[PDB]
Amino acid sequence: HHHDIIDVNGITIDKNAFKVTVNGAEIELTKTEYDLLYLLAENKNHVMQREQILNHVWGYNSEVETNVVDVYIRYLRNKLKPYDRDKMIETVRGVGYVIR
Ligand SMILES: [Mg+2]
Ligand SMILES: [Mg+2]
Ligand code: NA
Numbered sequence: 001h002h003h004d005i006i007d008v009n010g011i012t013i014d015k016n017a018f019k020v021t022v023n024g025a026e027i028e029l030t031k032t033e034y035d036l037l038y039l040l041a042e043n044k045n046h047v048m049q050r051e052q053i054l055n056h057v058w059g060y061n062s063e064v065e066t067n068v069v070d071v072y073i074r075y076l077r078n079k080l081k082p083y084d085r086d087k088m089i090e091t092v093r094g095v096g097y098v099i100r
Contacts, residue, residue, distance in 0.1 A: 018031055032072055036053070040098065044100070045099075050069045077089055
């Protein structure tokens, strides 16, 4: 076990850097979930096609199956659900995903 959060010399450092702040609390993510959320958020109101999300989050050269995007959208929605934030991630069937 590693201490979740450490304070030393007035510096606060969390074991897991990939957290976002919501309602005075924190949602704890993985790198890939965090990068996916960032992408969608930076592209608010602009629908992102699955292949574009794949390129930006997993890499233009990636050998991963494109449906990994759908998998991680589900993981991210599940992370947002306890904070009633999941509906911000909308599916555009046959295109991709968007935050409005
Ligand atoms: Mg951080
Ligand atoms: Mg943070
Ligand atoms: Na969490």
